[PDB]
Write a protein that binds this ligand. Structure first.
Ligand SMILES: Oc1c(SC(F)(F)F)cc(SC(F)(F)F)c2cccnc12
Length: 133
């Protein structure tokens, strides 16, 4: 029941400072423009210890499956090859991606009827708000 309140299908309803986050990450111009237009569906499900998070949009369809605390390979929507570890910290899913000596952290939290995603790269934060689909 670890992630019960995350499970479901969620639709992006607002984004703030995502272009600057993508710049900080190293995403190039054309990908930033097309990715920034996307209104993804995030689909979260749990089967035993395995959590699956899908992102579906006109830009890309991606999927990760993982066990909390257990590092995995991830190819991101912008085509980074990263090493990821996801943990639960006080009811927040904390997802750290490492690549090329760099690091970014994505936090996913339930707040009221929303799922709030905070993406941080150094000093730059983007906040993406999802509601139930
Ligand atoms: O919502 C997100 C998109 S847009 C979409 F989903 F359509 F791929 C793209 C990326 S990778 C990038 F930031 F480098 F661009 C995201 C990373 C973390 C959370 N959300 C993300």
């Amino acid at each position: 029941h670890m992630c019960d309140a995350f499970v479901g299908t969620w639709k992006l309803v607002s984004s703030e400072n995502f272009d600057d986050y993508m710049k900080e990450v190293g995403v190039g111009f054309a990908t930033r423009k097309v990715a920034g237009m996307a209104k993804p569906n995030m689909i979260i499900s749990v089967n035993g210890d395995v959590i699956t998070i899908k992102s579906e949009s006109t830009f890309k369809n991606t999927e990760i499956s993982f066990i909390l605390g257990q590092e995995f390979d991830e190819v991101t929507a912008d085509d980074r090859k990263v090493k990821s570890t996801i943990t639960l910290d006080g009811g927040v899913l904390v997802h750290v991606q490492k690549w090329d000596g760099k690091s970014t952290t994505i936090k996913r939290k339930r707040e009221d009827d929303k799922l709030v995603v905070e993406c941080v790269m150094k000093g730059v934060t983007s906040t993406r708000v999802y509601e139930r689909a």
